[PDB]
């Protein structure tokens, strides 16, 4: 049953101990208040479940809470069932009172209301919509407000799942996509997103990737694309539904057309259709641009949108090797937005492909250039330090709430102020859960790009080559913008080399920003590091060292070398960072490689199993990326064969198969449509 899985998750959540009763919700409101006063709320905060308990002996009330995404909230029904399951499943001391208050909070970023569902000790529930800007203000829930809230929770769950940097330790992610009828669940979610397309510019955007929110760049459009990635059988359905929306709601046509175009983007089967819809979308726009003298705010919205679509064409032409046409649109696109990073970037690509490297360098020069809530968690650092922030009363209270748990076993599962207990053990495998996972802990947040900050301090100190660390620190981390640029520089180096690049620099002086100078030097040092060989020297190298070497090799495009190092780093212990890079290179192989095989499906299946196990340990039961992998494997091997290959693996027990069978079941359901 799909209910089976949900039940197990709801019973398997961690517990964070509130410092001061009330702090948790007071801080939530404060944080919302800030976001609203500042310019962008964005997605607002992740959903929270708060539990209020009474220690009988002392007169003291104490709280516990945890973070979660993926509960539906199309109305109170699903959150209430969840609260009901939580309360019914309690195991508590005689010293803990049976009066318990549970609150579920989900933030609606369309209305900027925090929806709080409160399940009382008398087992009755009340919902309030809190406007945090005007403190006292509570409203009543219209249908529209519920739909906005549903949409908020779904967008937030997709965006969060797909970016590890946004996940707090111990975050519980539910498989929002699962349901009674798989196909109907997915359709429900798709139609929800599509109907909300007109309000997409209110959905926040990632400013790493874009200056302003655009019809093309915003969280809603991103989440829709991410979801469609795992539901390819629903593409034709989706294009139709939008075709239908544009008929009922013609004033919003631009939004619906843009969604058609971005959904079909990068699907080779659908290129003729994409090109055709772009055509119908763009031509009207040049007209509508010249028919406003006001320069009304709608003028920037449209020019941005027009440039974003043109970018899509440019990219398409470039990928197909037609540089003359690419340069044609690429010109038009850079005029309409001089503020557009993407426009200059493609303009640089065009020049690079036409081998005119000075113009490219000019283009590059021309380009345009959060949450604190982790006090509760302490990293284990490979067993080299103790992580316990609890006081004795805090622990007494915690234990009272979890009677079924042996106290010493409980103490071992606490990391700082959070109890990382996972009771139903879904996803369990011995090698992962009883060894490597305990060491290291969840890998998420800004530090999650490598293991430098998760591993033994001694292990880092042991690294012979200082540059190896220095080029991989969280500070010197590249980031979307400079990463894209570094890429263009690599393209250039591949042709004429670093010395060549450097001459091009001074040719350009004849006809240079400091941030660019800094990249040249970074690039140089990375190329050097790339040449290094850690093998055959009768020198012992740690996993961390292999992993860092591999990340550098990816960066410099030495693919085989990178795969080799990354695998080597996994030999002595599991490395969630290296593993993910391996799966990613299988899922999305580099374009330059000539349909080369970097990894064989047996190796992939092995890694994929461990990764699913690692993810499940820390509550990620959603795993959109891993589904994408399973989907690719089912395409190659077939579903039944793939299942057998999984069953043949020695680490596989029943707990992990619950999870895998669910994911496989869902993928299978999608094949009939």
């Amino acid at each position: 049953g799909y209910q089976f899985l949900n039940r197990d998750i709801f019973k398997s959540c961690p517990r964070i101990m509130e410092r001061q009763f009330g702090e948790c919700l007071h801080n939530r409101t404060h944080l919302i208040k800030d976001l609203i006063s500042s310019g962008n709320v964005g997605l607002g905060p992740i959903e929270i479940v708060h539990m209020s308990y009474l220690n009988k002996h002392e007169k003291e009330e104490f709280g516990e809470y945890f973070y979660v995404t993926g509960i539906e909230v199309s109305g109170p029904a699903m959150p209430v069932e969840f609260l009901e399951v939580l309360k019914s499943s309690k195991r508590i001391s005689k010293n803990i009172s049976n009066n318990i208050i549970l609150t579920y909070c989900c933030f609606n970023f369309f209305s900027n209301l925090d929806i709080r569902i409160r399940y009382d000790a008398d087992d009755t529930f009340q919902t309030t919509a809190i406007d945090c800007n005007k403190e006292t203000t509570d409203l009543t829930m219209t249908e529209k407000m519920w739909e906005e809230t549903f949409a908020s929770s779904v967008i937030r769950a997709i965006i969060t799942n797909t970016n590890p940097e946004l996940k707090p330790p111990g975050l519980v992610e539910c498989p929002f996509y699962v349901g009674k009828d798989t196909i109907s669940s997915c359709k429900k979610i798709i139609e929800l997103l599509c109907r909300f397309l007109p309000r997409s510019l209110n959905c926040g955007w990632d400013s790493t990737k874009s200056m302003q929110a655009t019809i093309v760049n915003n969280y809603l459009m991103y989440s829709l694309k991410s979801f469609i990635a795992i539901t390819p059988s629903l593409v034709d359905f989706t294009i139709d539904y939008l075709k239908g929306l544009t008929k009922k709601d013609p004033i919003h046509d631009i939004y619906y057309k843009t969604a058609m175009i971005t959904i079909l983007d990068h699907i080779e089967t659908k290129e003729l259709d994409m090109i055709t819809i772009l055509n119908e979308t763009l031509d009207p726009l040049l007209s509508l641009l010249n028919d406003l003298p006001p320069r009304d705010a709608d003028s920037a919205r449209l020019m941005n949108c027009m440039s974003d679509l043109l970018n899509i064409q440019t990219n398409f032409l470039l990928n197909r090797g037609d540089y003359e046409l690419a340069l044609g649109v690429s010109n038009t696109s850079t005029e309409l937005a001089l503020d557009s990073f993407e426009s200059w970037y493609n303009l640089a690509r065009c020049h690079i492909k036409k081998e005119e490297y000075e113009k490219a360098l000019f283009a590059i020069n021309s380009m345009p250039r959060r949450f604190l809530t982790s006090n509760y968690y302490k990293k284990p650092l490979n067993g080299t330090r103790e992580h316990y922030d609890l006081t004795a009363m805090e622990f007494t209270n915690l234990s009272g709430t979890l009677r079924n748990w042996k106290e010493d076993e409980l103490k071992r599962q606490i990391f700082g102020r959070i109890a990382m207990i996972n009771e139903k053990k879904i996803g369990y495998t011995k090698e992962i859960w009883d060894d490597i996972a305990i060491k290291l802990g969840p890998i998420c947040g800004p530090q999650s790009v490598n293991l430098i900050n998760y591993v033994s301090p001694q292990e880092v100190k042991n690294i012979k080559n200082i540059n190896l660390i220095a080029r991989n620190t969280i500070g010197k981390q590249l980031g979307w913008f400079s990463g894209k640029i570094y890429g263009l520089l690599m393209e250039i180096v591949n042709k004429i080399g670093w010395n060549g690049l450097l001459n091009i620099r001074t040719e350009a002086f004849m006809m240079c920003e400091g941030w660019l100078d800094d990249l040249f030097l970074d690039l140089y040092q990375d190329l050097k590091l790339s040449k290094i060989s850690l093998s055959n020297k009768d020198e012992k190298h740690s996993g961390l060292e292999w992993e860092l070497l591999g990340l550098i090799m990816l960066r410099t495009w030495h693919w085989e070398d990178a795969v080799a190092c990354l695998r080597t780093s996994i030999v002595a212990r599991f490395d969630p960072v290296s593993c993910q890079q391996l799966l990613k290179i299988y899922l999305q192989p580099p374009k330059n490689i000539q349909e080369v095989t970097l990894l064989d499906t047996d190796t992939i299946i092995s890694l994929l199993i461990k990764k699913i196990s690692y993810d499940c340990r820390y509550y990620n039961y959603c795993q959109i990326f891993n589904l994408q992998l399973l989907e690719k494997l089912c395409n190659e091997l077939g579903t039944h064969i793939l299942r057998n290959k999984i069953l043949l693996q020695p680490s596989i027990g029943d707990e992990i198969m619950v999870m895998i069978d669910a994911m496989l079941a869902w993928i299978a359901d999608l094949d009939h449509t």
């Binding site: 290129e271 003729l272 090109i275 055709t276 055509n279 763009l282 031509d283 040049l286 010249n290 064409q313 398409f316 032409l317 197909r320 037609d322 046409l325 044609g328 649109v329 038009t332």
Partner: protein
């Protein structure tokens, strides 16, 4: 409009004496007091020209990647003999094109124009020379343009290589005591293509013992139409025994039969039979 003004101090003057103001700090420093400047300074024709380019490009893109594009022809080798070869292509695909011309090339267009490139996917190239390399390629003329690709190069077989002999078997006379099984085993020994029961473009030889009932034998009439040699089974045996393809006239169904005594088939070999 385009109108020349003169400049005293940020105050500008017409030759009409009407005086237009402009910004003191925003005044172009190419200008000194008592210059003559000509304002207009803008152009509303250029926009039309730009709009024209935008659409030409959009139109080109649409045709090029938005329409149904006739695919390039794929040329394959069906079979190769000493004096001949049979070529075929994967079926033609034109999205919207009318097709005009399909043409074969070997070192140029001397090679002919396929009459029915649609209905018929093959051609036999007849006159050739033993053990000599050739090359062939297809060219496609469709409304939407001419595409072609993937020329191939093949070396005709020598006398001693029998791999290209493809036999279609006809009626055997039970009295003559030669069986289809014997012929097939023999064909296997010499490495020829397996035995057809039907006459195609690629059939080299029609093997036969029994003329009677010959009329109304569709295969025999096709064999004649295709100008394929009609030979007794002993011809295959002789090819095997002389380890090379041999003359066919001695084995015509009206030829003197004295030579057949020397090329009798051995009895069926069960090991080979059982194995396959």
């Amino acid at each position: 409009x385009x109108x020349x003004x003169x400049x005293x101090x940020x105050x500008x003057x017409x030759x009409x004496x009407x005086x237009x103001x402009x910004x003191x700090x925003x005044x172009x420093x190419x200008x000194x007091x008592x210059x003559x400047x000509x304002x207009x300074s803008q152009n509303l024709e250029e926009e039309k020209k730009q709009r024209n380019h935008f659409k030409s490009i959009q139109a080109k893109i649409l045709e090029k990647y938005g329409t149904h594009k006739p695919e390039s022809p794929v040329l394959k080798i069906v079979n190769v003999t000493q004096t001949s070869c049979v070529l075929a292509w994967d079926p033609l695909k034109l999205g919207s094109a009318k097709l005009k011309s399909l043409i074969l090339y070997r070192k140029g267009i001397r090679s002919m124009v396929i009459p029915n490139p649609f209905k018929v996917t093959t051609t036999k190239i007849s006159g050739l020379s033993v053990d000599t390399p050739y090359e062939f390629q297809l060219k496609l003329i469709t409304t939407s343009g001419t595409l072609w690709s993937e020329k191939v190069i093949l070396r005709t077989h020598k006398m001693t290589d029998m791999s290209g002999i493809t036999v279609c078997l006809g009626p055997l006379d039970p009295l003559k005591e030669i069986s289809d099984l014997q012929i097939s085993q023999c064909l296997s020994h010499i490495g020829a293509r397996p035995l057809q029961r039907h006459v195609a473009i690629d059939t080299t030889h029609f093997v036969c013992n029994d003329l009677d009932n010959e009329e109304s034998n569709e295969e025999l009439i096709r064999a004649k139409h295709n100008n394929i040699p009609i030979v007794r089974p002993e011809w295959v045996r002789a090819c095997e025994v002389e380890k090379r393809i041999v003359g066919v006239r001695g084995f015509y169904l009206d030829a003197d039969q004295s030579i057949l005594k020397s090329y009798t088939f051995p009895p069926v070999n069960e090991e080979e039979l059982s194995y396959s």
